[PDB]
Amino acid sequence: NRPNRLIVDEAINEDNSVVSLSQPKMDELQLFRGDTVLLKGKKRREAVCIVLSDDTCSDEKIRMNRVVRNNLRVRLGDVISIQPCPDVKYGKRIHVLPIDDTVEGITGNLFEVYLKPYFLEAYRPIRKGDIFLVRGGMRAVEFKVVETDPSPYCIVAPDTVIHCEGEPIKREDEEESLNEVGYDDIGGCRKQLAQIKEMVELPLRHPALFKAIGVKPPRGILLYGPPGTGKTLIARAVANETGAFFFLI
């Protein structure tokens, strides 16, 4: 019924700001791919990402990762209004600051240890006011973008100068840290975890609905397995990805 067409999903393929979108319809939004696209968040936030094709993606939903999801303050199973517009405009020398408690990881040059490989050939569109994650050297850290000269967004190429700061600042507490564990930090591809998803979807992602309708949601759940098999991950990473408050007895 003229519905937008966007659902949010975990993305198994491993990418910084890349999206899958269904082949059974490519003509409704009609994006050739690699074309800069809108993403509508909450509260007044938006994001920009690159799109690729998957035979094994659903006609239903959209593979996207944890850095895009946290920026938008979208969650799994959520829906974000989306719109294609193809256009993108280049930008300069994007500017960068440490975010939150994390820092001290880099001594001296910090764009040699971090930036060069990731902005290399990627054309990763990078926004004012978002956080992203660079991995390497046995540590991960995130660089906020406070000031970008062109706006609202800029595609990046290595024709531009390199400005440096490197001084930390406290990130807002309302934000959900990217080190707090979530679905991707749980490995094993057991698929059993998908079973806990079906149980905790409605009760703790949709509280008000159960006062409307008589049904019985499950009160308890036992995880069992020998020690070290990830039982505390599952709870931490269900509570983190659904926004519920995790307690610990």
List binding-site positions for ATP. Answer: 227-233
Of 14, 138, 159, 248, which lies in the binding site for a second copy, with binding defined by CB under 8 A? 138
Q: Is 215 in the site for a second copy (CB under 8 A)?
A: yes
Where does this chain touch a second copy (CB under 8 A) — which range of 20-28, 58-66, 122-130, 136-144?
A: 136-144
Residue 236, φ and ψ in degrees, nearest 5: -55, -40
Q: Is 213 in the site for a second copy (CB under 8 A)?
A: yes
Distance CA 200, CA 185 (A): 19
Residues that bind ligand ADP (CB under 6 A): 186-188, 227-233
Among 84, 105, 166, 203, binds a second copy (CB under 8 A): 105
* Total residues at interface with a second copy (CB under 8 A): 11
| Residue reference for tokens 């000031």 | 147
Going by C-alpha positions, the residue among 5, 3, 89 that lies closest to residue 48 is: 89
Which two tokens mark 45?
Answer: 């936030």
CB of 98 to ligand ADP, least distance (A): 25
At CA 117, angle to CA 111 and CA 121, rounded to 5? Answer: 125
Q: Is 66 or 127 the residue whose CB approaches a second copy more closely?
A: 66
Residues sharing a CB contact under 8 Å with residue 118, sequence separation 6 or more, in sequence order: 16, 124, 134
Which entry of a second copy, ligand ADP, none binds 188, CB below 5 to 8 A by partner kind?
ligand ADP
Q: Are 112 and 57 in contact (CB under 8 A)?
A: no
